[PDB]
Amino acid sequence: DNNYSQGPVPISARKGGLALTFVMLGLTFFSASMWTGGALGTGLSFNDFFLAVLIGNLLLGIYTAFLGFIGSKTGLTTHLLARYSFGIKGSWLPSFLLGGTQVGWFGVGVAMFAIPVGKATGIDINLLIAVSGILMTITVFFGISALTVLSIIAVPAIAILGSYSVYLAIHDMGGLSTLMNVKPTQPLDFNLALAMVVGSFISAGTLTADFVRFGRNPKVAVVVAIIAFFLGNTLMFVFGAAGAASLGMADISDVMIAQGLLLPAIVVLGLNIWTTNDNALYASGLGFANITGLSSKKLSVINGIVGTVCALWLYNNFVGWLTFLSAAIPPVGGVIIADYLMNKARYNTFNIATMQSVNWVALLAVAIGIVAGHWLPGIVPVNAVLGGAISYAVLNPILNR
Ligand SMILES: CCCCCCCCCCCCO[C@@H]1O[C@H](CO)[C@@H](O[C@H]2O[C@H](CO)[C@@H](O)[C@H](O)[C@H]2O)[C@H](O)[C@H]1O
Ligand SMILES: Nc1ccnc(=O)[nH]1
Ligand code: NA
């Protein structure tokens, strides 16, 4: 397997911070973060917005730097990392939930491209799905190299064309002064808002090691996560709020259409989805490879076929389902981190032989974290991450050995 799905990335295949910075910005530069940014924008004061977006994405940035640090220290995908805490076969459970929801998001994302475009152009929505997902599936066959190519192309155009569009929109609106006078008629609960920020990428963010395992230097992995999730996801949130405030449209590609920038709009839509969806498919192949021992390349292509032929169905009904399953993903992150923090020395080698088949305490910890998210007050994802990590740190030394 060229994606090294079954063991540590060897020294000659490692990559530098530049490629991994763009790959990860390619993940967060995504329309759904713009949409959520418009919700936060219309439901919060100008100060509350930047406080919620900055606090939330910094929490995201710290959570993902840990995972990226561990991914890079070891050269292991999230799924191989999970073998330490969940067991060799126990990890199939996180791997399927993480991988499956990403196949979900991929199909969703194919529809997010083909639907606006076929409406704007009259072209058959079905035909566009076929062509979009097929193109996106072919590129994932070529692995971390393809993700590097797409995002070093996509990310500059999105940041720069998108930023210019934000500038126009605040200018034509009366400038910053007008923007900071807009008032929500029904302000959003601040803690709900934090959950929406963190919740925009905690699922893909829990698979950070699948990409930054390629980094030679663990400290650089921390920089990648912060640049991508603190700075990058914030920028996407600002795009969405600016578009909501100036025009009632939270996707910057709707703003550009409003401004007569039709070609920038379609290009920015296609580039932001293609990068996020390729990451999704890539990580899902790694995840299903941990389960089946098959080539992650082959599985990624299979995942893209299924995701394409089911795109609309996933866009419609299965989004509430995709959000539901995903509630088990944050605790899985806290367990992995906590197990590394507790048992660093264990991670010195990738040694199948000292590993468990299944650690029931890991599964028990995930359930507890889910309960902590559903009951405890505060920020649901943070409570759900800390639920799994704290209860694992308590019960694993006791009930495992
Ligand atoms: C040849 C040119 C073709 C280019 C056509 C492509 C441009 C289309 C851009 C995306 C298509 C529509 O995108 C649409 O944006 C609105 C923003 O109000 C999103 O709405 C979103 O923002 C609101 C707040 O505004 C949030 O409460 C919520 O998270 C979400 O529903 C819609 O969920 C999405 O359907
Ligand atoms: N593929 C994804 C899109 C949006 N958010 C995620 O967490 N993952
Ligand atoms: Na993207």
Author numbering: 4 to 404
Original authors' sentences:
CodB is a cytosine transporter from the Nucleobase‐Cation‐Symport‐1 (NCS1) transporter family, a member of the widespread LeuT superfamily. Members of the family are responsible for transporting nucleobases and related molecules into cells, often as components of salvage pathways. We show that CodB carries out the sodium‐dependent uptake of cytosine and can bind 5‐fluorocytosine. The overall 12‐TM helix topology is very similar to Mhp1: TM1‐TM5 are related to TM6‐TM10 by a pseudo 2‐fold axis and intertwine to form the bundle and hash motifs.
CodB was purified and crystallised in the presence of cytosine using the lipidic cubic phase (LCP) method (Caffrey & Cherezov, 2009) and the structure was determined and refined at 2.4 Å to an Rfactor of 20.1% and a corresponding Rfree of 24.6% with excellent density. CodB crystallises as a monomer with two molecules in the asymmetric unit orientated oppositely with respect to the membrane plane. The cytosine substrate is found at the interface of the hash‐motif and the 4‐helix bundle, sandwiched between two aromatic residues, Trp108 of TM3 of the hash domain and Phe204 of TM6 of the bundle domain in a face‐to‐face pi stacking arrangement. The cytosine forms two direct hydrogen bonds to the main chain at either side of the breakpoint of TM6 of the bundle domain: to the carbonyl oxygen of Ser203 of TM6a and to the main chain nitrogen atom of Ala207 of TM6b. In terms of interactions with the hash motif, as well as stacking with Trp108, there is a hydrogen bond from the cytosine to the amino oxygen of Gln105 of TM3 and a potential water‐mediated hydrogen bond to Asn280 of TM8. The sodium ion is coordinated by the main chain carbonyl oxygens of Gly29 and Phe32 at the breakpoint of TM1 of the bundle domain and the main chain carbonyl oxygen of Asn275 and the hydroxyl oxygens of Thr278 and Thr279 from TM8 of the hash domain in a square pyramidal arrangement. In an unusual interaction that is not seen in other Na+‐coupled LeuT members, the side chain of Asn275 is also within hydrogen‐bond distance of the side chain hydroxyl and the amide nitrogen of Ser34 at the C‐terminus of TM1b, providing a further link between the hash and bundle domains when sodium binds. Between EL4 and the tip of TM3, TM10 and TM1 there is non‐protein density, which we have tentatively modelled as DDM and monoolein respectively. Although TM10 in CodB is one residue shorter than in Mhp1, given that the temperature factors are high for TM10 and the helix retains the proline on TM10 around which TM10 swivels it seems likely that the lipid‐like molecules that we observe in the density are preventing the conformation adopted in the substrate‐bound form of Mhp1 rather than a substantial difference in mechanism.
